[PDB]
């Protein structure tokens, strides 16, 4: 109903968007020290052990 | 004749303070749903108030 301009919603948006990107870049690092096997198949031996 | 010339001045000076009054009834009512969702405090509601009265 235009109570606030139609460019303070694009900067409100702006925002929005730059701060979702910033919480996906965040997860991104979240989701790299759960560190998965990038393929399938056999997996060797555990050359660096728990606590190092 | 200066009954005449307040018969013909006041039929444009209430109405243009007839615009005046919708205008800032408008903004009252603009700015009553900018508060009601939350963006901007109850003061500036009140300040909106005090100018449409």
């Given at each position: 109903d235009q109570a606030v301009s139609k460019q303070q919603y694009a900067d409100a948006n702006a925002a929005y968007l730059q701060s979702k990107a910033a919480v996906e870049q965040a997860r991104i690092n979240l989701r790299y020290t759960?560190?998965?096997?990038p393929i399938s198949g056999r997996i060797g031996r555990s050359a660096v052990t728990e606590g190092a | 004749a200066d009954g005449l010339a307040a018969r013909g001045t006041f039929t444009e000076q209430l109405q243009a303070q007839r615009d005046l009054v919708k205008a800032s009834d408008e903004y009252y009512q603009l700015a009553d749903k900018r508060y009601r969702t939350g963006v901007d405090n109850y003061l500036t509601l009140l300040d909106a108030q005090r100018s449409l009265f």
């Open positions: 759960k560190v998965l096997s | -």
